[PDB]
Amino acid sequence: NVALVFSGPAYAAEAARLGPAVAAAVRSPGLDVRPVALVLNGSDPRSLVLQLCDLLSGLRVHGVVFEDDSRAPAVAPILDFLSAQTSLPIVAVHGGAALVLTPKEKGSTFLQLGSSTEQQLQVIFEVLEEYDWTSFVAVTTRAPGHRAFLSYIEVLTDGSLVGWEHRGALTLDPGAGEAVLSAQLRSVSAQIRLLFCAREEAEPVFRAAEEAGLTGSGYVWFMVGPPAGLFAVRSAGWRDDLARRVAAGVAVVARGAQALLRDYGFLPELGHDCRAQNRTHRGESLHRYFMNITWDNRDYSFNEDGFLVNPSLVVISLTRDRTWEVVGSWEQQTLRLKYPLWSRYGRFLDDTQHLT
Amino acid sequence: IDLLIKLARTMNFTYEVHLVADGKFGTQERVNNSNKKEWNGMMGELLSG
Amino acid sequence: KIVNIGAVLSTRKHEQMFREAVNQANKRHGSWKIQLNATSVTHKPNAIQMALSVCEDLISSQVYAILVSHPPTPNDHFTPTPVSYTAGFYRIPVLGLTTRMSIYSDKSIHLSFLRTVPPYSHQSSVWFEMMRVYSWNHIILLVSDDHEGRAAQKRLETLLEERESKAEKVLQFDPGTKNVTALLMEAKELEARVIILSASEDDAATVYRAAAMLNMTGSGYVWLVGEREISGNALRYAPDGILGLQLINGKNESAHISDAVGVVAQAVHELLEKENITDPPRGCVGNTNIWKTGPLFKRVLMSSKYADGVTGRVEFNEDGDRKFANYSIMNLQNRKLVQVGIYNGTHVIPNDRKIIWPGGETEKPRGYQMSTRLKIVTIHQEPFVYV
């Protein structure tokens, strides 16, 4: 018995078909899965906690997978607390709840089927050295955690034998102006400008690239946060399509209680009650499980916070036809990718100083 | 060790000599964990405390 | 047309005192159409009903800023936790009072959350001003392994490397302490005698019992204790010479509210311009959009200068915290606290009454006390060090 939540009217039709699609997808003796179709819509903080409390009280639904049409992260905080209130794990596979909300509240069972920006920063760290782009300018915008987002860059820089460069003096916002930001953007060390930016600020910075001449292939960006030749990593954003997103989402959740079940015979009735009991301290083993759960020949292990540690990350290179395709993968530090890495000076990318 | 004894006779402090553990004088080298350089031998024993 | 704000106070009895802060909307700048309607509501007993009523009862009154007070029950930011989550999606600035929790500081979790009282994290900043005028350099401390307790841990060393040669020991103890004695003898060799407590009140009481059988509360010691870890069980079994601190505006809300509402209605005055001044998204059946005037006036509120109230020093940093607040560190003297100083950007230490130390001594002791025993490392080297 599981509950599937949808955010977006366009996904209402898929609810009926996606129900049976996962009932027979994962087979585990001793437990039966009964997906629950939902009708609610809207991001307002009323139906988010309304039907969920009713579903928990009567249906006793264990395992919730979150799919959202938009990338807005404002839906996660409302759902984040409800995971801690009911002490039941909740996973999100696609939509707004992709960025990891840190630091989470104490005793929070919220989980996300995506890689954190720290994991995102680590995988792209390999790309620059693999293609010999060690020099670059650090660029970011006014973000809630941009100070911490660039903090990991400092740890990444000067690490190992490779010598890297970072600026960290960019606070992209429309108040400065595109030309002024371009003037601040001229403080550069190479043709690469690693940029952390949000979907709200994506449009203002997109035009600033045109003013600074970054549209051409000579100068390229690097989008790490949620113009041509722009590099990005979606952390399997386009992977799993639609069916595999929910099929693998519940397999880890269903197998999570197996460790407790094999330890002793106990059925956690925490999810069967939402309000009939006026107590909030009835929570235990919130993160005691979930160490070595694997599926789809991949390590589905989650950190203490509740995000993937070894995910099936993918590399996204912006194509000229406004299409995003997988151009690389990170599977246990395997950077074979495609488009042979020799390349250089004629693909992807001062004669008075450089001469063959 | 005689120069050590004359040292203790001047500053009026006690001691308990213990030999080094690994057996190397000391050289700052990078551990297998990326390039976090860490000393060894006497220098490791002194910086650690 | 009409400017209205809401608030989440403690009890309905104190709600009537909040109306005195909204009916006075006439005596502000401009006063063209400033007619504040409180529309306040007592906080629900639990957090479940907060989300079931915030959308259609508080926000629906076309409110723009929310005042949140500490619940009377001994909770851990129970009232503002879902309110910040609900208002975070709606992009509604909220003003906090009497909420000294340091986890409400990162903008990723609570982008829209500003409080008029600095949390326990800012205690360590004021603490740095104490040994500067008390002549100690070496320093060790023990702290709980939780975000609230550990908040002071990254606060001290960020302002200690430029004024000191690092704390000698920064050892930490698990908050779920159960007769944890092995963590004290392992720290009783640095000869610091200047230990600092930045733990929870219950745990700070627990370590006090463990600090008796080996007499770490005798002469030659000085202890720094946070405000949260003084009253209650932490007062019992504590050393006589506790140098803890408190807050002048402790359990004070009307003064905080009056200073608050002085800036809630103020920021709206300069808001009136040719730019987008649309109201927050009304309605609750369907709401996904974000009003674009939220962040526009948020900086104005943060940058607003209010020279009224407690010395007119309600200043805001990049986070929502009071600046240059007066903490006025206490001093335990025979199971009761006395006043010895105050902080006004620079610590002020009036004579007032004598300052005592653990063991009953009055003269401030040098915490070093030296260490005659010394540890020595050699190696086999035939001409020099035979073996």
Please give the full DSSP string across A10-45, using - where no structure is assigned. Answer: GGSTHHHHHHHHHHTTS--TT----EE------SST
Round to the nearest angstrom and report the end-to-end CA distance of chain B.
21
- The CA distance from A99 to A305, in Å, is 12
Q: Output b/e per residue, A207-245; b: 16+ Cβ within 10 A.
A: ebbeebebeeeebbbbbbbbbebbbbbbbbbebbeeeeb
What dihedral do alpha carbons C59, C60, C64, C68 form, nearest 10°?
Answer: -30
- The CA distance from A231 to A243, in Å, is 27
Q: What 3-state class would DSSP assign to C294?
A: helix
CB atoms within 10 A of CB A16: 10
A43, A74 Cβ separation under 8 angstroms: yes
Sign of CA dihedral C314, C317, C318, C320: negative
DSSP for residue A175: T
- The CA distance from C190 to C137, in Å, is 13
Q: Which two tokens stand for residue C330?
A: 């206490």
Q: Which two tokens stand for residue A5?
A: 């939540």
For chain B positions 6-35, those within 8 Å of chain C (CB to CB) are 12-20, 23, 25
- Helix, strand and coil content of chain B, in percent to the nearest 5, comes to 35, 20, 45
Q: How many CB pairs under 8 A join A and B?
A: 5
DSSP string, C29-67: SS-SS--------PPPSSSHHHHTTIIIIIGGGTEEEEE
User: What residues of chain C have any CB closer than 8 angstroms to a CB in chain B?
Assistant: 372-380, 385, 387
- The CA distance from A275 to A278, in Å, is 6
CB atoms within 10 A of CB A301: 15
Beta bridge mates, A325: A317
The total number of residues written for chain A in this structure:
356
DSSP string, A245-302: HHHHHHHHHHHHHHHHHHH-----TTTT-SSSS--S-----SSSS-SS-EETTEE--B
CB atoms within 10 A of CB C204: 26
Nearest residue of A to residue C146, measured between CA atoms: A106
Burial class of residue A168 (count of CB atoms within 10 Å of its CB; 0-12, 13-18, 19+): middle
Sign of CA dihedral C71, A77, C113, C5: negative
Q: Which two tokens stand for residue C172?
A: 């930490």
Residues of C in contact with B41 (CB under 8 A): 379
CB atoms within 10 A of CB C295: 15
- The CA distance from A204 to A173, in Å, is 8
Q: Which two tokens stand for residue A167?
A: 């600026």
What dihedral do alpha carbons A302, A304, A309, A312 form, nearest 10°?
Answer: 30
Looking from the CA of C377 toward its CB, the CA atoms found within 13 Å total: 17
A231, A104 Cβ separation under 8 angstroms: no
Subunits close to B (at least 3 CB pairs below 8 A): A, C
Q: Which two tokens stand for residue A30?
A: 């001793």
- Helix, strand and coil content of chain C, in percent to the nearest 5, comes to 25, 15, 60
Give chain A's largest Cα–Cα span.
Answer: 78
The total number of residues written for chain B in this structure:
49
Q: Give the angle A61-A67-A73 at the CA atoms, nearest 5°.
A: 115
Round to the nearest angstrom and report the end-to-end CA distance of chain A.
67
- The CA distance from C115 to C92, in Å, is 14
Q: Which residues contact A49 (CB under 8 A, 6 or more apart)?
A: A78, A82, C48, C51, C52
CB atoms within 10 A of CB A158: 12
Residue corresponding to tokens 């700048």: C29
Subunits close to C (at least 3 CB pairs below 8 A): A, B
Could you tell me whether strands C63-68 and C4-8 are parallel, antiparallel, or unpaired per DSSP bridges? parallel
Q: Which two tokens stand for residue A126?
A: 């390999």
Q: Which two tokens stand for residue B2?
A: 């005689």
- Give which of A168, A208, A209, A204 is closest to A187, Cα–Cα: A168
Residues of C in contact with B13 (CB under 8 A): 372-374
Nearest residue of C to residue B49, measured between CA atoms: C375
Residue C291 in contact with partner chain A when CB distance is under 8 A = no
Contact check, Cβ <8 Å, C81/A81: yes
- Give which of A234, A293, A229 is closest to A259, Cα–Cα: A293
- Cα A262 to chain centroid distance, Å, stands at 32
CB atoms within 10 A of CB C99: 18
DSSP for residue C203: H
- Cα A212 to chain centroid distance, Å, stands at 30
- The CA distance from C40 to A11, in Å, is 38
Quickly list H helices, chain A: 14-23, 47-54, 75-86, 117-130, 146-156, 178-185, 199-211, 243-263
Q: Which two tokens stand for residue A352?
A: 């008075």
- What type of residue sits at position A150? L
Measuring CA to CA, how many Å separate C258 from each of C22, C38, C255, C271? 10, 13, 5, 21
- Give which of A78, A121, A70, A67 is closest to A101, Cα–Cα: A78
A3, A63 Cβ separation under 8 angstroms: yes
A274, A86 Cβ separation under 8 angstroms: yes
C264, C256 Cβ separation under 8 angstroms: no
- What type of residue sits at position A257? A
A260, A38 Cβ separation under 8 angstroms: no
Residues of A in contact with C101 (CB under 8 A): none
- The CA distance from A299 to A311, in Å, is 6
Beta bridge mates, C343: C347
- What type of residue sits at position A323? T
Choose the closest CB to C375 out of B1, B16, B41: B16
The total number of residues written for chain C in this structure:
387
C197, C177 Cβ separation under 8 angstroms: no
Q: Which residues contact C279 (CB under 8 A, 6 or more apart)?
A: C62, C291
Contact check, Cβ <8 Å, A85/C48: yes
A282, A291 Cβ separation under 8 angstroms: no
Q: What 3-state class would DSSP assign to A163?
A: coil
Element (H, E) at A325: strand A324-330
Q: Which residues contact B28 (CB under 8 A, 6 or more apart)?
A: B37, B38, B39, B43
- Helix, strand and coil content of chain A, in percent to the nearest 5, comes to 30, 15, 55
- The CA distance from A222 to A170, in Å, is 14
CB atoms within 10 A of CB A71: 17
- Cα C104 to chain centroid distance, Å, stands at 10
- Give which of C37, C43, C44 is closest to C8, Cα–Cα: C43
Residues of C in contact with B48 (CB under 8 A): none
- The CA distance from C248 to C342, in Å, is 10
Choose the closest CB to C377 out of B12, B14, B18: B18
- The CA distance from A342 to A338, in Å, is 11
CB atoms within 10 A of CB C189: 11
C39, C4 Cβ separation under 8 angstroms: yes
Q: What 3-state class would DSSP assign to C109?
A: coil
- The CA distance from C189 to C187, in Å, is 6
- The CA distance from A104 to A107, in Å, is 9
Mutation to test the A interface, candidates C55, C109, C146, C289, most A Cβ within 10 Å: C109
Q: Which residues contact A60 (CB under 8 A, 6 or more apart)?
A: A1, A269, A271, A272
What dihedral do alpha carbons A315, A320, A324, A328 form, nearest 10°?
Answer: -20
Beta bridge mates, C339: C330
- What type of residue sits at position A267? L
Mutation to test the B interface, candidates C138, C376, C384, C386, most B Cβ within 10 Å: C376
Q: Which residues contact C357 (CB under 8 A, 6 or more apart)?
A: C219, C221, C222, C241, C363, C364, C365
Q: Which two tokens stand for residue A26?
A: 């994962």
Q: Give the angle C292-C297-C301 at the CA atoms, nearest 5°.
A: 150
- Radius of gyration, CA atoms only, chain B: 15
Q: Which residues contact A117 (CB under 8 A, 6 or more apart)?
A: A99, A100, A149, A152, A196, A224, A225
Measuring CA to CA, how many Å separate C53 from each of A41, A189, A347? 18, 54, 58
DSSP for residue C218: S
- The CA distance from A180 to A186, in Å, is 10
Beta bridge mates, B17: C376
DSSP for residue C12: H
C114, C320 Cβ separation under 8 angstroms: yes
Method of structure determination: cryo-EM
Q: What 3-state class would DSSP assign to C151?
A: helix
Q: Which two tokens stand for residue A303?
A: 């950190």
Phi, psi of A59 (to 5 degrees): -70, -25
Sign of CA dihedral A94, A97, A99, A103: negative
- Give which of C85, C61, C72, C57 is closest to C9, Cα–Cα: C72
Burial class of residue C56 (count of CB atoms within 10 Å of its CB; 0-12, 13-18, 19+): middle
C268, C306 Cβ separation under 8 angstroms: no
Contact check, Cβ <8 Å, A45/C85: yes
A75, A97 Cβ separation under 8 angstroms: yes
Nearest residue of C to residue B44, measured between CA atoms: C377
- Radius of gyration, CA atoms only, chain A: 22
Element (H, E) at C297: helix C294-303
Could you tell me whether strands C141-144 and C172-173 are parallel, antiparallel, or unpaired per DSSP bridges? parallel
Listed by the residue before each break, gaps in chain C with C–N over 2.5 Å are: none
- Give which of A238, A181, A232, A241 is closest to A211, Cα–Cα: A181
Contact check, Cβ <8 Å, A43/C89: yes
- Give which of C122, C80, C132, C332 is closest to C247, Cα–Cα: C122
- Give which of C335, C266, C328 is closest to C302, Cα–Cα: C266
